[PDB]
């Protein structure tokens, strides 16, 4: 199989190292797991030491977080917007680490409505008292309002699906959101 | 070359046959070998044809239809013997065992009838060790709580002084 030694690599001084060993099993590699968008496709590979790695080729209903309130929920991944290095990876629609994706915000709207009560972009005494006690921090970014109006949100995955079998991330916000939006404004 | 249910090729072919499919016996674990086998369809190259009876005809063949074999072995498990003898819930299951004769065994006098063993019958030996295991669990919990209380006293003294 594919090897990861430096014996085949040319030395730092320019000399080419001759063959010394046959390919060993403590240095083996494996094929990439380009997990495109589709119905959940996860299998198992027995890695060295008896452990198991969960691969991924298609993933649905991933996990994404919201750090302002510290709430994470399962959401359905729609599509991939940007990915650094080769941009052709976006065209072939593969999910990897550090690649922004588009997500739905219907569960976020439902949780926000059932928590704060006061609807964004317009009896029950205990509910009203809770709303009054938790009113004041309901303000959100203008970008966070436009995404709710448009029904789609930008999220960044912070997990490797080819290693752990999950595509987990967080909602993009702040200066990173501004940088990414200004990066993709001339492209879209 | 033996049979192979699945291969549609109308002649013998070779494949990296695995122990999961029939016509193999592993010499050691993780062993796969290349062997030749025939297809799943029938041609003119066959010499012995294996067939099964579905429904008997009007006439009876004297050699096979008349002759029948008896079932010389019976149930072993508690569920198997219960379904074999259709006994009630409390019917002394130990009294429904099959007894054989040992006249050819050259026993001479008083032929010692031999019967198989019955499995999965409730015996108080297993319950004793199960209770002991639960005993060990409760002893572990009580010891954990006792040493936790001792360390709680130690931590209370330390935070006090």
């Amino acid at each position: 199989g594919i090897t990861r030694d430096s014996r085949h690599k040319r030395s730092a001084t320019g000399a080419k190292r001759a063959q010394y060993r046959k390919k060993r099993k403590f240095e083996l590699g494996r094929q990439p797991s380009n997990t495109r968008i589709g119905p959940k496709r996860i299998h198992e590979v027995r890695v060295r030491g008896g452990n198991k790695k969960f691969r991924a080729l298609r993933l649905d209903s991933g996990n994404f977080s919201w750090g302002s309130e510290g709430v994470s929920k399962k959401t359905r991944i729609i599509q991939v917007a940007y990915h650094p290095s080769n941009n052709e990876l976006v065209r072939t629609n593969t999910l990897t680490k550090s690649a922004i994706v588009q997500i739905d915000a219907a569960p976020f709207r439902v949780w926000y409505e059932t928590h704060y009560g006061i609807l964004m972009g317009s009896k029950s005494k205990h509910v009203q008292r809770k709303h009054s006690a938790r009113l004041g921090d309901s303000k959100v970014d203008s970008a966070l309002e436009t995404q709710f109006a448009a029904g789609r949100l930008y999220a960044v995955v912070s997990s490797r699906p080819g290693q752990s079998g999950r595509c987990d991330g967080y909602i993009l916000e702040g200066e990173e959101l501004h940088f990414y939006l200004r990066r993709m404004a001339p492209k879209k | 070359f033996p049979m192979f249910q699945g291969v549609l090729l109308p002649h013998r072919v070779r494949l990296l046959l695995r122990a999961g499919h029939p016509c193999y016996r592993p010499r050691r674990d993780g062993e796969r070998k290349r062997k030749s086998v025939r297809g799943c369809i029938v041609g003119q190259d066959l010499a012995v044809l294996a067939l099964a009876i579905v429904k008997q005809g009007e006439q009876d063949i004297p050699g096979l239809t008349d002759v029948t074999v008896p079932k010389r072995l019976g149930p072993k498990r508690a569920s198997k013997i219960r379904r074999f003898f259709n006994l009630s819930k409390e019917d002394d299951v130990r009294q429904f065992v099959i007894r054989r004769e040992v006249v050819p065994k050259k026993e001479g006098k008083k032929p010692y009838t031999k019967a198989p063993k019955i499995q999965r019958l409730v015996t108080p030996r297993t319950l004793q060790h199960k209770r002991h295991r639960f005993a060990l669990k409760r002893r572990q919990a009580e010891k954990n709580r006792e040493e936790a209380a001792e360390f709680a006293q130690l931590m209370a003294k330390r935070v006090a002084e």
């Binding site: - | 040493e147 936790a148 001792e150 360390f151 130690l154 330390r158």
Partner: protein
């Protein structure tokens, strides 16, 4: 290569085992356990080569299956169990309660003790951390872990675990005037009293120890072992007390031995 080794040849065996070079080709090859194979004595070596309670490898196995070697109060059956430093061997069919301690020259020797003082096993701690459920746990040099230890104990300290009844009953700190034995090195097996601790950046604390005769020497923190304080060694010392009896004085001792018969 391709996996672990199960055969240890002789001559390559540790020198302090004092195994005969002839009469065989291979060494006992201590099995994995609580002590490193380079710093442990196999049970067969201790019972046969060091104690002569059985000859050749066969009779020693017979008594081990006979369930008589209650090491640390429990009977084991491994003929090559890695019995490390400060181990107790209690043969209750005979009454002996042997102790495993370094001698003056740095080799294991017979340290038979009474029934008392053979229950608690003095052990150095390795590190202190926090375990599951927010609780502290301690790990010793003999591969033994203690749950809920004394909060006043730090690394490179001493405990006296009771064994069988278990649990730490007493602990000893690491500071000046404490009696310290050297576990390994070129100053093997000699107790003194730590007087100076020299700090070196990164690692390699240097411990200066003064013996009974006030001759002075130095060792490493990873190789020291605190047993007692200002002449209050809670454990018994073997013959010679581990001072540093040199060759020039051992010659006089041998001459005096000759001038006795």
């Amino acid at each position: 290569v391709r996996g672990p080794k199960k055969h240890l040849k002789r001559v390559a065996a540790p020198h302090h085992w004092l195994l005969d070079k002839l009469s065989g080709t291979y060494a006992p090859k201590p099995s994995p356990g609580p002590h490193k194979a380079r710093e442990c004595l196999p049970l067969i070596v201790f019972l046969r080569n060091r104690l002569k309670y059985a000859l050749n490898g066969r009779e020693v196995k017979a008594i081990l299956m006979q369930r008589l070697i209650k090491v640390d109060g429990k009977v084991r059956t491994d003929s090559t169990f890695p019995t490390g430093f400060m181990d107790v061997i209690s043969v209750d069919k005979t009454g002996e309660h042997f102790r495993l301690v370094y001698d003056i020259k740095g080799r294991f020797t017979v340290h038979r003790i009474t029934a008392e003082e053979a229950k608690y096993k003095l052990c150095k701690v390795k590190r202190v951390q926090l375990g599951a459920k927010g609780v502290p746990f301690l790990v010793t040099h003999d591969g033994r872990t203690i749950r809920y230890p004394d909060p006043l104990i730090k690394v490179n300290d001493t405990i006296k675990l009771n064994l069988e009844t278990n649990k730490i009953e007493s602990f000893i700190k690491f500071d000046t005037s404490a009696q310290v034995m050297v576990t390994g090195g070129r100053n093997m097996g000699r107790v003194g009293t730590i007087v100076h601790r020299e700090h070196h950046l990164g690692s390699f604390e240097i411990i200066h120890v003064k013996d009974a005769l006030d001759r002075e020497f130095a060792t490493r923190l990873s190789n020291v072992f605190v047993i007692g304080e200002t002449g209050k060694s809670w454990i018994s010392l073997p013959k010679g007390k581990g001072v540093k009896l040199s060759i020039t004085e051992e010659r006089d001792r041998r001459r005096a031995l000759k001038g006795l018969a």
